[PDB]
């Protein structure tokens with residue numbers, strides 16, 4: 001079950017990221033979510049609480065979801081890696097592979113989402129099967145194992161580049177989340 005998997009993950013020592021962590025950040029939300037959001041890795045506040053997207057970038061994500069009319073409790077949120085990399089660096093290829101093989105793939109199998117929104121280039125690369133430019137792939141529909149994939153900018157990028165001008169990261173993200181909401185509402189019932 002997802003709950004057993006979550007419990008087991010708390011004791012994971014599969015990669016070097018276990019060395020500097022405080023708490024494993026497995027993921028949270030609706031276990032039967034139609035929409036799954038996947039970020040890069042935990043930040044400082046996530047590492048302290050064991051919860052994903054609760055720091056500054058997470059608060060922005062909450063604003064984005066609320067504005068789109070998507071209740072956070074109804075979606076499932078996690079990341080490519082479950083442990084905070086040193087000084088918020090991106091996870092290395094071996095860390096991402098080990099963590100996704102051990103946890104993420106099983107989470108996706110159990111939750112069975114119909115739409116996956118990878119936030120940032122690292123998460124986007126995992127689902128698109130190759131290294132990609134987040135600015136070029138964001139806001140477009142792809143597919144991974146029969147699941148719809150819609151890459152979007154990482155909220156941290158929006159905080160680092162907070163311009164309100166037309167075509168800015170924030171503006172494009174608003175357009176993107178509205179598209180996610182539209183697609184979510186048009187989804188057929190899950191195959192059970």
Ligand SMILES: O=c1cc[nH]c(=O)[nH]1
Nearest residue numbers: 039040041043052053
């Ligand atoms: O949960 C989180 C928090 C910050 N950054 C991420 O990629 N994920």
Ligand SMILES: O=c1cc[nH]c(=O)[nH]1
Nearest residue numbers: 063064067170173174
């Ligand atoms: O980028 C965005 C989109 C929606 N709402 C926000 O606060 N920021």
Ligand code: SF4
Nearest residue numbers: 012015018082083099
């Ligand atoms: S990042 Fe993933 S694989 Fe590495 S120790 Fe944490 S839970 Fe295990």
